[model samples]
Target: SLGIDMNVKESVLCIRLTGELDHHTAETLKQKVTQSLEKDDIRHIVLNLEDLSFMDSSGLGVILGRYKQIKQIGGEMVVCAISPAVKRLFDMSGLFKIIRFEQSEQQALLTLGVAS
Candidate 1:
């Protein structure tokens, strides 16, 4: 199972993901995030993966899709609080090269200019 919590601050969207991020849950997460951005001038996204227990290739695809979505709108996305296990996948997949990583949620927010 997967759960997502989203918060919108001005032009920024902060998303917290919990549980497994696999093919089964990817589309649901994507749809929820897509809906969350409707009618809002979002310029940044902060993905909090602190509690993400697992992620597979499909999860990466959805995340990449969101990255492209933000970029197409001239925005940016950052990730934070990834567990070591999840980070291994990210590292192996070369995700770190494209997606910026921060030490904490507050740092991620600051990086996205959503927090002072």
Candidate 2:
């Protein structure tokens, strides 16, 4: 199961994820993010993963796909408050090379030039 909380501020979409982010939940996240991108003037993405407990390759693919979409338009994606288990997965997958990490969602937004 998964829960997604999303909001937009100053062209930055902040997404908070909870529960497992595996194949079953990946599509929902993708769809929701895509909808946000289409409806809003989102130029950057900030993922708040503090509550997320699990994730797999499918989740990574969705995140990487979103990164590509934002990057194509000169935007950036930042991940924040990741758990150690998820962080290890990211490390092994080399996802750390493409995305930026922060200690908190506010910091992530700050780095993206968004006001708190």
**What number of backbone clashes does candidate 2 have, counting pairs of residues 3 or more apart or in separate chains?**
0
Per residue, candidate 1 scores C-alpha lDDT tens digits across 30-89 of 775566455456456777765666577777878777766666666776778766666676
Stretch of 10 with least lDDT, candidate 2: 102-111
Among these predictions, the greatest lDDT belongs to 2
In TM-score terms, candidate 1 sits at 0.78
The best candidate by TM-score is: 2
Candidate 1 to native Cα RMSD, angstroms: 2.5
- Candidates in order have lDDT scores of 0.68, 0.69
For every candidate in turn, the CA RMSD to the true structure comes to 2.5, 2.5
How many backbone clashes can be found in candidate 1? 0
Name the regions of candidate 1 deviating beyond 4 angstroms.
36-38, 109-115
Q: Which stretches of candidate 2 lie over 4 Å from their true place?
A: 40-42, 105-111, 114-116
Per-residue accuracy of model 2 over 2-52 as CA lDDT, tens digit each: 777776677676777777778788888778666656664545666776566
